Design a protein around this ligand. Structure first.
Ligand SMILES: O=C(O)CCC(=O)C(=O)O
Ligand SMILES: [Fe+2]
Length: 324
């Protein structure tokens, strides 16, 4: 009731100014739109675990397409939403980390160090997976992150799985909503979670950036799986803490953080954004949202949303760009 009332309130406020894509009354009740209390950017989400209990397979495909079309809605070239989240949508997706360990075990992967930024270790995928399993305990594992592995360069089975998953088909780089380029991905990686290491902190973080085709801004889409050694969904772990900035504030945010958007993402921003900075940025009228993403969630980031991710529990990500 309250969720629907708040979603309807926000839809009414947006429609007073902007022409939004349409959605049936029956589907609208599955959509959650809210503004972040402190930052005031707008988050759109849904819960696949709830949807799948009410909609048949053809109806769900219709919902998923309308949801993605609404979540990428723009006015005057500017996304209205700062992030879209499909909660639980990857629940039925096969275990991707295990798939790579069993089906591509000898692939040489690059692994970061928990203690030295300048160290990169090469080893077979299978040995990385065994190392992560061996050190996994209470939501983190005591081993380095896996550097991103392109799935597009056998991996067909992983791309087919994503292609068939909820929401994703139309917004794959080759999907119906795409204007198309292997630079788009998908890419796969694994993060072990922030943790103290024997003690010093391992910070598990991606600085603020805008995603780009390299230069044109682009949308990004991601899939999160918790790391598990082979269950109440409402208690599933938070895996990322996310800060997204309203796309309308791209230039204000970049100027405040002294970002060089010509740099590649990794070197666009040299300042970590924390609540002190967010509160100072708010005084300039910048809007943002801060939220957690949980295991088995999918998400997407419209173009020109500057965003910053922190890994708070061990997870795998599969992510790509889509030129809508
Ligand atoms: O997950 C991360 O650490 C960054 C993910 C991201 O930045 C994206 O999906 O565009
Ligand atoms: Fe990104």
């Amino acid at each position: 009731n309250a969720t629907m009332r708040i979603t309807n309130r926000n839809l009414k406020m947006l429609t007073r100014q902007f022409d939004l894509p349409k959605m049936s009354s029956r589907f609208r009740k599955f959509v959650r739109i809210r503004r972040h209390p402190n930052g005031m950017a707008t988050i759109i989400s849904c819960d696949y675990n709830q949807i799948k209990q009410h909609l048949g397979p053809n109806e769900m495909k219709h919902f998923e397409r309308q949801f993605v079309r609404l979540g990428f809605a723009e006015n005057n070239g500017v996304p209205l939403f700062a992030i879209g989240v499909m909660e639980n949508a990857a629940e039925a997706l096969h275990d991707q980390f295990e798939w790579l360990a069993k089906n591509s075990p000898n692939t040489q992967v690059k692994v970061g160090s928990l203690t030295n930024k300048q160290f990169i270790e090469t080893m077979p995928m299978k040995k990385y997976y065994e190392s992560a399993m061996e050190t996994l305990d209470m939501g983190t594992f005591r081993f380095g992150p896996l550097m991103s592995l392109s799935m597009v360069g056998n991996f067909k089975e992983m791309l087919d799985a994503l292609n068939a998953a909820p929401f994703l088909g139309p917004i794959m780089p080759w999907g119906d909503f795409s204007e198309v380029t292997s630079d788009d991905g998908p890419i796969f990686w694994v993060r072990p979670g922030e943790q103290m290491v024997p003690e010093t902190a391992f910070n598990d973080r991606t600085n603020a950036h805008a995603d780009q085709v390299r230069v044109k801004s682009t949308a990004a889409v991601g899939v999160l799986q918790g790391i598990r050694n082979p269950y109440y969904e409402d208690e599933r772990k938070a895996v990322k803490e996310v800060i997204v900035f309203d796309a309308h504030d791209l230039h204000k945010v970049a100027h405040h953080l002294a970002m060089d958007l010509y740099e590649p993402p990794v070197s666009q921003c040299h300042r970590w954004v924390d609540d002190a900075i967010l509160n100072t940025m708010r005084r300039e009228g910048i809007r943002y949202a801060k939220l957690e993403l949980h295991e088995n969630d999918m998400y997407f980031l419209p173009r020109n949303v500057i965003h910053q991710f922190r890994t708070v529990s061990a997870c795998s990500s599969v992510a790509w760009h889509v030129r809508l």
